Structure 1
Amino acid sequence: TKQITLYTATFSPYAHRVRIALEEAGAEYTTYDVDILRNMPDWFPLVNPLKKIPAMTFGGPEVPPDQPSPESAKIAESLAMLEFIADLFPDAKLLPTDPVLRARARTFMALYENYVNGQFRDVWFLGTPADPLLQALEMLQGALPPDGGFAAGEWSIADAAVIPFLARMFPYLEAGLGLYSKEDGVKMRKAMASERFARIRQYVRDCRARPSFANTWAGDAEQVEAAKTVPMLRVGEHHHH
């Protein structure tokens, strides 16, 4: 019954994670866009002192999102939000009930956060080499159940954590967004279309087919355009090794 407000930005895969979980939960919630990278509102540190999106408020009196209440609980960090939503909506079964299957979900989130996410960041924003990213994606792909299904079998918050990044990769590569070289762009497009990565392509299709994805995605072209607003995705700059 307590209000949920999610401070969002279309380009932000971290915020996307939390929109997906809130859709899967059947939650009632409000979103409020924040131009966090170009023009942060002066009140935004009241909802997240770290000055990052996503930010969440929970409970407190019903107020406009640009007039946040000191009485709402302020929740930071997208993965903590995913676990919070699973805790708030247990009947939505956003995690398995079996401990080992739950661990598969947590391990998958950690594999992504610790070994893949930084490689996406460094390849796209710094133009570091693509091979370590592809190796990390092959590792992540190896953690999926072979025959189909999601990270822990049934869909869970682990798939909300990972699909925003994987789903952006394909249209961003096709639009040439990112500071990596032409050569590495070709390499990544060929690899991600190759048999080596058939399983993760299935995984991406499977997650994208769910309403929680459709209802939280602007469309491939619209997401590309939002991404071009990110300052670190400087058009015309590339790094080479």
Structure 2
Amino acid sequence: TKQITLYTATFSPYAHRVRIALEEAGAEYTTYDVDILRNMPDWFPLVNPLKKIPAMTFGGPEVPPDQPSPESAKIAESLAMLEFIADLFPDAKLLPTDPVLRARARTFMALYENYVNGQFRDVWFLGTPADPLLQALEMLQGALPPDGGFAAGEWSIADAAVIPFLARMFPYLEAGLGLYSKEDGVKMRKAMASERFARIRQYVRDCRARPSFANTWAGDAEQVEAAKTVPMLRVGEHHHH
């Protein structure tokens, strides 16, 4: 198989998505953990001109990750990477075969990206109000099959897309990480433990139980420590509405 190199960082939920999918695929791959606390290496724009993590190279000669080759394909954007891995490894069935079930997976990924993800970003990094995030999570939970299972029934890349963010939410809340107020932290912790969110808590447990999560997660406390190194999580800053 043509080589896969993923440029990643422990804190990054977008990178985590692609690590999960690569584990589920059974792929051979290399990871290279960047250090955002130091100057970005001058080679990094060769693998992602937008200066984003994850970055992915595919094919080309086998080279050290810090010496990327011009011959490798440079694949940008985590959701594009998820669909790429699903295309590369059809025997791993990272999407359903049925068109309608595949659409459920794609719909779930779009619902998350369009209505939930920006709320996580704004509540955590800007300290905007928590209620719209809780409303968007309740909407997303309503898209899950009610009786159990994953977004499209069997596990798929839709679950790789979403679990990195939901799995960080619980330990980040408990550690008090984020720019939201104390009041909104209390509200979120009570809501996420309440009966209204029992289905999404089961979904999180089901996704975390898979080896693809265990093998790509540093541990709750270690992930909290990695997130504390993120400059935009301006420590000691909180916003109040």
After TM superposition, list the pairs within 5 Å mapping 1:179-198 onto structure 2: 179-198=179-198
- Which portions of structure 1, spanning 4 or more consecutive aligned residues, are displaced by more than 4 angstroms? none
Residue 192 of structure 1: how far off its partner (Å): 0.1
Structure 2 Cα separation of the partners of residues 194 and 38 of structure 1: 41
Q: Distance in 2 between matches of 1:165 and 1:37?
A: 22
Given the two structures, how large is their TM-score scaled by the length of structure 1? 0.99
CA distance in 2, matches of 1:28, 1:186: 43
Residue deviations 1:184-229, cap 9 Å, x none?
0000000000000000000000000000000000000000000000
1:39, distance to aligned residue in structure 2 (A):
2.5
- Three-state SS of the structure 2 residue aligned to 1:5 is strand
Question: What is the alpha-carbon distance in structure 1 between the residues aligned to residue 53 and residue 34 of structure 2?
Answer: 8
Deviations 1:102-146 (A, max 9, x none): 000000000000000000000000000000000000000000000
Residues 146-197 of structure 1, C-alpha deviation per residue, up to 9 Å, x if partnerless? Answer: 0000000000000000000000000000000000000000000000000000
1:40 positional shift: 1.1
Instruction: Count the aligned residue pairs.
Output: 241
Deviates more, 1:37-46 or 1:121-130: 37-46
| Shift in Å, 1:88 | 0.2
> Per-residue deviation at 1:3?
0.1
Q: Which residue of 2 aligns with 1:230?
A: 230
- Separation of aligned partners in 1, 2:118 and 2:34: 24
- CA shift for structure 1 position 69: 0.1
User: Counterparts of 1:232 and 1:58 in 2: how far apart (Å)?
Assistant: 31
Q: Normalising to structure 2: TM-score of the pair?
A: 0.99
- Cα displacement (A) at 1:37: 5.9
Cα distance, 1:36 vs structure 2: 3.5
Partners of 1:23 and 1:72 lie apart in 2 by 21
Structure 1, unaligned runs of 5 or more: none
Q: Provide the C-alpha distance between the structure 2 equivalents of 1:166 and 1:37, rounded to a whole number of angstroms.
A: 25
Unaligned runs of 5+ in 2: none
Asked if 1:221 is matched to 2:221, the reply is yes
2:11 corresponds in structure 1 to 11
**How far did residue 38 of structure 1 move?**
4.4
CA contact (8 A) 1:36 1:53 kept: no
How far, CA to CA, are the matches of 1:109 and 1:10 in structure 2? Answer: 22
Q: Give the superposed CA RMSD.
A: 0.6
SS of 2:238's partner is coil
* Residue 35 of structure 1: how far off its partner (Å): 1.8
CA distance, structure 1, for counterparts of residue 15 and residue 48 of structure 2: 13
Report SS of the residue matched to 2:230. coil
Do the aligned residues in 2 keep the contact of 1:21 with 1:85 (CA within 8 Å)?
Answer: yes
The worse-fitting range, judged by mean Cα deviation, of 27-36 and 165-174 is: 27-36
Partners of 2:142 and 2:200 lie apart in 1 by 9
| Contact persistence 1:36–1:52 (CA under 8 A) | no
CA distance in 2, matches of 1:234, 1:25: 37
Would the alpha carbon gap of residues 182 and 38 (structure 1) be closer, same or farther in structure 2, given more than 3 Å must change?
farther
Contact 1:173 1:185 in 2 (8 A): yes
Match of 2:135 in 1: 135
Question: How far apart in 2 are the matches of 1:110 and 1:84?
Answer: 17
For the residues of structure 1 that align with 2:51 and 2:179, how far apart are their CA atoms? 25
